[PDB]
């Protein structure tokens, strides 16, 4: 819409977006992951018995 002459952001290269705008060569190669929670180790040993 003319509000910006460029997009400098983590904007992934897509098929739909490529039809309307021209992406540069990627400056960062990556993919999609899943983020989940973590636990600190405890050894879960109740006692010496």
């Amino acid at each position: 819409s003319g509000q910006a002459d460029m997009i400098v952001a983590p904007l992934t290269i897509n098929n739909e977006r490529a039809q309307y705008i021209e992406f540069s060569k990627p400056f960062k190669y990556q993919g999609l992951t899943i983020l989940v929670k973590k636990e600190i180790p405890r050894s879960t040993l109740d006692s010496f018995m």
Binding site: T12, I34, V36, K38, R42
Partner: protein
Amino acid sequence: AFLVLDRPEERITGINDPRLRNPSDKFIYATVKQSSVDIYFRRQVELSTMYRHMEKHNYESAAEAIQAVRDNKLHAFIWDSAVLEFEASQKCDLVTTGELFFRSGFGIGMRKDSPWKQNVSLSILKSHENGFMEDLDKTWVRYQECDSRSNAPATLTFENMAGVFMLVAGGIVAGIFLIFIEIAYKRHK
């Protein structure tokens, strides 16, 4: 055997994991609204059941959704590895699980009529070969903060071995109540 086999719960394995491919209300996963992840799941007919379970929980930002996982209000967050792997490196209560899917890089968008498109790409390829973009990786992405996440063993701590400390303490007190028996026994005998 206990210490070696004392392993915690295994996490998700990826999109192919049956836990989220056929979801349940007790396990909620979502992404950022109006992003590339949305049009990835939208255009994929096979990943249709995943979309609706994500639609109602879809967040408005990546910072909000990451905080939800820290707040236990979200159990999974599908997002760019280059960003999630930064949060996992910094925050020691989050871990990225699964294999990369939809390997599409980050690009500098411009309009199709732009005169800079040729020079922008060349100025990015040059920065890749010159090692400039590895500097920007070092100062911004490569921190690693705390220790790496793996199946590493847990050092035995006080909470584990506290019964054997009080047993020795209890044996000191019992001896105090047993020295009197020894002294009295000699007098009796």
